[PDB]
A paper describes a structure:
Microtubules (MTs) are cytoskeleton polymers built from αβ-tubulin heterodimers that associate head-to-tail to form polar protofilaments (PFs) and laterally to form the hollow MT wall. They are central to many aspects of cell biology, acting as tracks for molecular motors and generating force via their dynamic growth and shrinkage. Furthermore, the structures of most MTs polymerised in vitro, as well as those found in many in vivo situations, include a single discontinuity – called the seam – in the otherwise helical arrangement of their subunits. This seam is composed of heterotypic α-β and β-α lateral contacts and standard Fourier helical methods cannot be used to determine the structure of such MTs.
Furthermore, the alternating α- and β-tubulin subunits are structurally very similar and are thus challenging to distinguish except at near-atomic resolutions. Binding partners attached every tubulin dimer act as fiducial markers and greatly facilitate structural discrimination between α- and β-tubulin. Although it is unknown whether the seam itself has any particular function, common MTs architectures with seams (particularly 13 PF MTs), are composed of protofilaments that follow a relatively straight path along the MT axis, which is speculated to support efficient motor protein transport. The determination of the αβ-tubulin register and seam location during image processing is essential for alignment accuracy that enables determination of biologically relevant structures. Here we present a pipeline designed for image processing and high-resolution reconstruction of cryo-electron microscopy microtubule datasets, based in the popular and user-friendly RELION image-processing package, Microtubule RELION-based Pipeline (MiRP). The pipeline uses a combination of supervised classification and prior knowledge about geometric lattice constraints in microtubules to accurately determine microtubule architecture and seam location. The presented method is fast and semi-automated, producing near-atomic resolution reconstructions with test datasets that contain a range of microtubule architectures and binding proteins.
Residue numbers in the entry:
A (entry chain N): 44 to 142
B (entry chain B), C (entry chain b): 1 to 429
Write the structure that this text describes.
């Protein structure tokens, strides 16, 4: 065959922690652009923090709910947002309101 | 008032604009410093439409230059009339387009489109009465197809009343300057038919013939090709910047030339175009300038107008001339070529007459002719799309950027809706 | 009359002041000797506010310089405009702060605070009508947090009517120039909310961005960072030293900007700030200076004002300009950003217009904007305090200087009272 496995990008949103006035940039997350989950933290580093957020960088990715720590890239699903934090403590504000 | 904000995009649209602002500065008399060295006070009266007066009798262009890599912006600031632009307006990223619509529109455009709109909104507030925007890009590359059409959708959501015209460069049919140009063209025409008002389709192949055949040039560089596009772009707004006997502007052409909210792809045309030695064996009269605007060898979109019918014709003249001599010729080419015009639109010629000629000549013209002859241009894009999509080749570069196969279906189906419309109004009754 | 006594403290507040007195001497025309070489007689008319006339047409600054070790005072007297200070005012100890609030406030401050107040009381009697004091320190180090807040309490017990304003440097959130800076900040904000009148919070991180982004500097030393703070400090009292059309002073800003006896932490802002080459692509008008004072990229406290609402706004302009052109812009930014202002205070903009510009420019400004956006600044101090206090770490250096754990409780509880107040007046009705 030649019509291959259709190397597909998930369209997931990334709310950064605490920032209520932020929308979350949809990343073309695939298994082709990141061989490991630890490489996904590297792309989240520059394109989330600009002047006022995250001195520790990017360590812990939570769910939008959030009650679970995201492991590898297999624990992600198509079309759901995720709260990107950098500490064990979680901030419970309304992220998904008025996308 | 009636100020215009100029937006450039891609490698192509920057180098068109980098010659375009040289042409505008030749009319209004602006040195490469930015000061004024003119002779007539008519140059400074309507100067605000493309300029903002800085402190100390210096004028800056109202331009916004956009790219995804600094390989082109460094060429602009280094060339002549490169010091004239403001250093704040050079908005550019680092990743580069990669000659990809999906990188230009979704991923790398999103990291830059917020930085551009702050420059857009800053220039929109400084103008008193905003006339409308204009854009110069190309449908072949990555940035001019992706980053440009992203900027059109963000502007139209914030300005649902201003006019929005694009001097898009449609790729030529015979040679192909890009392997994936049927994908970049098809995925951008879907954006242009829903968010613009009028669009001036320009093909590269038609510009090579005019320098070769008509102007008799030996070594046509792009500085001689872009000088014909820039002379056309000045000729559209030349009645907005100067007094004239019968005046039109970007609004009146958007009402006259566009009878339906989709059918708004034009073809330009310029006259006179002499040679370097044959410019003495020719008398510059209005019937001479008329019989050069209408033949097939002086279009700029690669399509012979004889295959279809015209719908509307704009003929913006420049220089002092008789109005009777204009109105006789615009009737004369409408009677004898009566089959080549559409029937249910009578008196389908819009005329505008300025007063001040271009620098060097005595009288000039500018042909803006809508036609059904651009159904051939969207046959070849729609055919070469389906020839490359039925095998699903060159597709994994677009799927990995967050896109599905359904997006290719609705973009292609939107184009065959458009060719069915130009086919319908060719055989009306 | 209306004389001001200037007090400096810490390594930071001395080097801010050592550039500040260079700026004031550039306006009034004072050589490094101390004589006068001006051109206009307006410089000598209000000279008494920051000077005492010595015998022989020489002027000395009314300054009090305080440190705990002579490692910084030797740098002041050796630099340019270091001979201008009087040798009696250099009050300094020998033990050194050790970068410790408990050493700076209780133990080693007590051996020096009596020597400072004799210099304070000597300068207070020599003035005719005392306007008020001002202080420059920092909340991060040892001396500026401990010795400074001890001097504020001793002054307020002896002068319960004069105005007392501090240009405190609040530590930046991302980088940390001191390990124990959540302790030095929290134990000093408890002193500042009860014994001052207004306080200009300045962050280091915001000053690095302005030199990098806005001024386009390559190697910003502190002489280029402190020159922006000193230009702000001159701009607050610039109507008190010069005639103007509409005049304000340190008293009128303390009435207008402060609607409640606690909510008095401000954020400064200066305009215009050009580049070294981009200063010609810009027209210096009042609507140009207006649209630079309000955006987020030209604050000095590291907090975006869009997260909260403003309460009061002071806009001290300099140079000759139209009052109508000022009053139109201060209405214009209040209508379109109607959500960004608090509702139950109508016409929340205080305007002051001087006449004499700074040395070199034509017109300038000074933004003093109170906001609820500094609730973010006291989130990060209160969080980093409790992150370091619940383990009781770095604590034995403070217990051995005569302090209990209860003092940390009331200082932290005073701060969460303050964040509850700015939260309450963000959602009033
Ligand atoms: N007419 C004209 N077309 C140009 C010029 N330079 C590039 N192009 C066109 O631009 C296209 C190539 O894309 P490019 O300019 O790199 O744009 P981008 O890839 O979207 O940034 C082709 O269709 C070229 O014919 C020029 O000077 N004149
Ligand atoms: N803006 C600014 N801050 C300074 C300067 N010098 C030191 N600082 C700040 O001062 C603090 C360090 O404390 P220090 O100056 O030694 O004061 P002390 O320890 O209380 O005597 C840090 O927050 C530095 O950022 C300067 O020239 N400019």
């Amino acid at each position: 065959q030649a019509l291959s496995n259709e190397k597909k990008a998930k369209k997931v949103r990334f709310y950064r922690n605490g920032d209520r006035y932020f929308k979350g940039i949809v990343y073309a997350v695939s298994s082709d652009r990141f061989r490991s989950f630890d490489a996904l933290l590297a792309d989240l580093t520059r394109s989330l923090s600009d002047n006022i957020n995250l001195p520790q960088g990017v360590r812990y990715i939570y769910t939008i709910d959030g009650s679970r720590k995201i492991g590898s890239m297999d624990e992600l699903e198509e079309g759901e947002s995720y709260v990107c934090s950098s500490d064990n403590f979680f901030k419970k504000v309304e992220y998904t309101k008025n996308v | 008032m009636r100020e215009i904000v100029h937006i450039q995009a891609g490698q192509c649209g920057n180098q068109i604009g980098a010659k375009f602002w040289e042409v505008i500065s030749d009319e209004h008399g602006i040195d490469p410093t930015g000061s004024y060295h003119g002779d007539s006070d008519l140059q400074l009266e309507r100067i605000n439409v493309y300029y903002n007066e800085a402190a100390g009798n210096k004028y800056v262009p109202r331009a916004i230059l956009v790219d995804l890599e600094p390989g082109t912006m460094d060429s602009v600031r280094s060339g002549p009339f490169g010091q004239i632009f403001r250093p704040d307006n050079f908005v550019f990223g680092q990743s580069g387009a990669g000659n990809n619509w999906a990188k230009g529109h979704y991923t790398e455009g999103a990291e830059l489109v917020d930085s551009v709109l702050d420059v857009v909104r800053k220039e929109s507030e400084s103008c008193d009465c905003l006339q409308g925007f204009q854009l110069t890009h190309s449908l072949g590359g990555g940035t001019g197809s992706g980053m440009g059409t992203l900027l059109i959708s963000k502007i139209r959501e914030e300005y649902p009343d201003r006019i929005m015209n694009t001097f898009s460069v449609v790729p030529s049919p015979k040679v192909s300057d890009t392997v994936v140009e049927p994908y970049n063209a098809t995925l951008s025409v879907h954006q242009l038919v829903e968010n613009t008002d009028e669009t001036y389709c320009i093909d590269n192949e038609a510009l090579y013939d005019i320098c070769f055949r008509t102007l008799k040039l030996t070594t046509p560089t792009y500085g001689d090709l872009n000088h014909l596009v820039s002379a056309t772009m000045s000729g559209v707004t030349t009645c907005l910047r100067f007094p004239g006997q019968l005046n039109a502007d970007l609004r009146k052409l958007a009402v006259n030339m566009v009878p339906f909210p989709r059918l708004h792809f034009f073809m330009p045309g310029f006259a006179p175009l002499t040679s370097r030695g044959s410019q003495q064996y020719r008398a510059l009269t209005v019937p001479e300038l008329t019989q050069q605007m209408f033949d097939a060898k002086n279009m700029m979109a690669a399509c012979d107008p004889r295959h279809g019918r015209y719908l509307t014709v704009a003929a913006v003249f420049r220089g002092r001339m008789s109005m009777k001599e204009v109105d006789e010729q615009m009737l004369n080419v409408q009677n004898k070529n009566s089959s080549y015009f559409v029937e249910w639109i009578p008196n389908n010629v819009k005329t505008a007459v300025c007063d001040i000629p271009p620098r060097g000549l005595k009288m000039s013209a500018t042909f803006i002719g809508n036609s059904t002859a651009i159904q051939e241009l969207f046959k070849r894009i729609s055919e070469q799309f389906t020839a490359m999509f039925r095998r699903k080749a060159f597709l994994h570069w677009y799927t990995g950027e967050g896109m599905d196969e359904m997006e290719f279906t609705e973009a292609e189906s939107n184009m065959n809706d458009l060719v069915s419309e130009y086919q319908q109004y060719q055989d009306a009754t």
